[PDB]
Design a protein around this ligand. Sequence first.
Ligand SMILES: Nc1ncnc2c1ncn2[C@@H]1O[C@H](CSCC[C@H](N)C(=O)O)[C@@H](O)[C@H]1O
Lengths: 215, 12
Amino acid sequence: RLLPFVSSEDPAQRLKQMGTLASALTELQMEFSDDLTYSSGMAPRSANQARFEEGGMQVLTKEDIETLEQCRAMCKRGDCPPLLVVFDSREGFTVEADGQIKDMTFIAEYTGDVDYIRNREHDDCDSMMTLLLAKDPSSSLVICPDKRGNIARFISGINNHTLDGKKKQNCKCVRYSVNGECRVFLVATRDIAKGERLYYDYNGYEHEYPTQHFV
Amino acid sequence: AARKSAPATGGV
Ligand SMILES: Nc1ncnc2c1ncn2[C@@H]1O[C@H](CSCC[C@H](N)C(=O)O)[C@@H](O)[C@H]1O
């Protein structure tokens, strides 16, 4: 079952954490957005229907929905998860734990503008994320945090080409149906210590992300 | 395009 995150107790530390995110967003010319956003110029909210997912989509349970809403409310009142955005010479911006994060803890929703994959065929963004994979490829959707987004777009991925790379993975990106809509969330897959860098698998489903050069 | 992706079944 999903567990809510435990925000750092010192308010100064939460301030620092949010500051590191604000500066990274600024560097990438982005605004902060902790929800999926829709528009008629791209993909209307009505296109996001989990029943369109080829082969079906797992449904988030009432209990885990309650936990998701607790976490969302915490973020809005200023209790963010204990995470620091830090520049790394090899990886660029990366995300690391700034407090303990237990196995099964909700980390973040992957947010940004939602759009049709067919509309992003020629897009250079390095942070596109699958939202809905439909039988008809012209109905499939992607999340694009190129203009708006949150901390999730800064999390690193593993090298899918090395025997040792999977050993680094300490969280997982999953897609769940919530009130009938697709949603993408990140969850810890083991206990994570302070200072530890977060990594998930960019190629969970489709293998559309090149990682042979990753550290 | 380069696209990250996640499963829609199988839990965590
Ligand atoms: N394990 C890894 N090793 C090296 N680079 C990585 C990496 N994981 C992610 N990255 C970098 O991060 C990109 C994904 S978007 C993640 C945020 C990015 N590091 C940034 O500075 O904005 C990848 O294209 C790659 O350039």
